[PDB]
Each structure stands twice: as C-alpha cells, then as structure tokens.
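Worked example (supplementary).
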Amino acid sequence: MPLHMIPQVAHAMVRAAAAGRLTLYTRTRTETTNFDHAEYVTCGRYTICAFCLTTLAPHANVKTIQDSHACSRQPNEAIRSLVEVSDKAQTALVGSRTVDYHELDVKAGFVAPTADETIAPSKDIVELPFRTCDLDDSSATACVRNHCQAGHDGVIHLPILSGDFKLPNEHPTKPLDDTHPHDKVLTRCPKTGLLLVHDTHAHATAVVATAATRAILMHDLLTSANADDGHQARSACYGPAFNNLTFACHSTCASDMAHFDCGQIVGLDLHVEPSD
Amino acid sequence: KWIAEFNNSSLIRKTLTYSGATYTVQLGPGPTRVIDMNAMIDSVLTLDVSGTILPYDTNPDLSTSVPAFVLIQTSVPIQQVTTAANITAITVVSAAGASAINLAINVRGQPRFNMLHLQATFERETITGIPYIYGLGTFLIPSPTSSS
Amino acid sequence: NFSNPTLMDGLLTVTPVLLRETTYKGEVVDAIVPATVMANQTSEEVASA
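After joint prediction of all chains, the assembly is encoded as:
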C-alpha cells in the first residue's frame, strides 16, 4: 500500500481526526502523542504513515524530515486530540444563560415545560469513541432535555420549535446554554441512537470543516511534492473556518436562526406523563 | 467447497468490535456466508458491495454502520462455534473508514448503498493453515447495536 | 407527500459513438499516452471511465 487518490484519502484521514477517532499509531506506540511520526493510521485499510505523510513506509532514514512529515500535520494531530478532549471533558459549565425557561414538575403527572430559549444543566461530554456521552443514558435524558424540559437551548441556541421541532425525533445536535465562554457541547438527538457530543468552539456554522481539510495541504506537499490547487477548491468546499476554534463566539448564524427559531412559532414543548 | 454457511441456532450477538465499541454480529439464521479460505490457493477477496445496506431494523445506529469483511481464525470448526469463547480470532479486515455515511440512495426511501470495493489479501502463507481460515460479510458498527 | 427527490436507479449504457479522438482522463485529446497513465488510476476510476 502506496497511497492513491492522495488528497481524498487524506480527506478521510482528516475526517477521522475531526471526529476525534483517528488511529494514530507509530510502530510500537499506539498514539503519536509526542511527535514521533506514525506508521499505521487505518484509513479504511489504508495504513497512513506520518513518517512520510504517505503510507506504510517512511520516505527516508532522516528522522528529522520524517518527523517533519509528522510536524506538518501538527494541525491534524492537534485537532484530533482536541476534539477527543472536548467530546469527553472540556471547559466547565460555569453558569447558564437564559435564567430559566424550563420546568420539572414531578408531581404525579410530570409537568415538564420547555419554553422558547431554555437553559443548560446538561454537560454530556464523554464517550466520543462510539458511545453515549453519559454512560448509556444520553439517549433517555435528552428526551426530557429537549421536548419535556429542555436542558440545552437558550440565547443563540437550537432552532427547535421553529424548524427542528422535536430533537427526541429529529436528527441534529443541541447547543449548551452556558455563561462560560462557548462551552457548547452539542448533544445528539435521542433518535440518532448514538448520542455523541460536538463542542462548537466557534458557535454558528460547521467551522472545523475548512480548518481540518486545509491540513491536507501540508499532507499533499510532503507526500506528492506540492499541493496541487487543494485549498483553492477546499476553501469553498468545506464549511467555514471562523475564529480561533477555542471556545469563542462566532455568533452570526446561531445568533439569528437558533436564537429565534428556538421558540419562534410554536414556542412551547411539553411533557406531562410520569417519566422525566 | 470454499464457501459454506453457519447454521441456524446458536446466537452470538454482542461482540466488542473496536475500542469500547460494539456490534451485534448476531449469529444465527443463515448469517451471510462462511468463506472457507483454508488453503484455497492464493486470491484477493474482491468484495463488491452495492445496493445492499438495509438499515438496522429500527436503531439510531443508522450512522456508523458499514459493509465489512471479517476473517475468522480459529481451530474450532464453525459448527462448534457457539459462544464468544470459541472464536479465537474475529479480525475485521475489510472496512476501511469504519464508521459510516449515508451512501445509500436514501432520498426516495431507497436503501441503496453506494458501490464499495473491499479487499482482503488472501494469502494462505500469512496464516499457513492450522487455525483454519474463515470469513464473513457484514454491516459492522462501532456504535452499539440493540441485540433485542 | 412524496418527500423523496428521486429514485430512478437503473442502468446507463454510454454508447461512445465517436471513435474519433480518444479521451485521456476527461481530457479530450488526440493523444494516447500509456506510460503516463501508470499509477494514476484507482480501480474505481477505471471502472467509471
């Protein structure tokens, strides 16, 4: 295995990085923790080799350049690790924004109102490697925390009851109403079955998508001599990098859409049955 | 000769597949086929999957489920393989990016899976017999599947 | 009702009528260059071509 369709398989690599789980394995050691150029990153059978940016085998016995191949994907390494981190444990929920637009009335018949722009008790975090963030419980608690007594949404947050109605039922992810700077751990839908968390480090668009794919430029150069157009195409292609990507604003879209469409139409979501 | 089946009744359902990640291989009523590559010359198991995806019954494990090939590497002959203990080796060989995306022509209700090209370098020298060589076909997941 | 965009999935048998001027990888050229074709084709690409 010499790599073929280099920019793409590179693509895929980085997609693994972006969703935390990337098999970053140099010879004996399971993750390229320190900058010792990996040997086996399983890109669907394609064992990626950081040694050469290419696959299986190193470019030379020049452990300086070979590590440099490695160093080149400092963006990839950092993203991978970082996304793992956020989707496990990150910047704590220091206070929650919208005072209190929700209620848990466990009073025989469970009066659990969701109103407009709730708030966020929920932290979720954990279990990015294919599990439900909080144990096996994510699934069930989010039921309550969207429809019933929505422990997610708030100010510039989750465009539910205008658009994406019931996140017990509908696919997407739920932003964390938190005073603390952008610690938005977007809990997946109960119906999605597997409830992971994606902390939006800059909160409105997809952001990581450009940022991540852009690191294939560094790939393409020291693999296949020079990065042929790549970003020229990648720039549009992949969801917009705005700001730092460390728990910060971004605002903008989530500022307009999610803020209003949280409620907007129906405004209300309820549960009254003993469950919650 | 080189391709037989496991027989209904046993049930090897939950098997760990990845790092703390689980799939129900769910072994019972006519589970695909058992590819008997125990010293059956040297070949490349070119698995050409298209059409077939058939999403999990009704699991939100729709995302993260791939068409895969798994070789089974045990000195316990298939008909003896009733619990996890038996397996020796279940090695997931053929999946590549082993998560998922809706490659199925899903828009119109269809569960047509995009054309995949899988490869398993069946070199009998790799193993040299002895723990007789098997393989299976399956929509393998990390994201845990509801056996019930 | 019919939320599905559309699922008309069968066969598409390209009839390359114009035996004049064979294509090198999307490039409609008067040229066929074997040695450069080498290592620039995935199985997928070949099949697709």
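Two points are worth noting when inspecting this output. Residues 43-48 of chain C form the longest helix (6 residues). Chain C has two helices and no strands.
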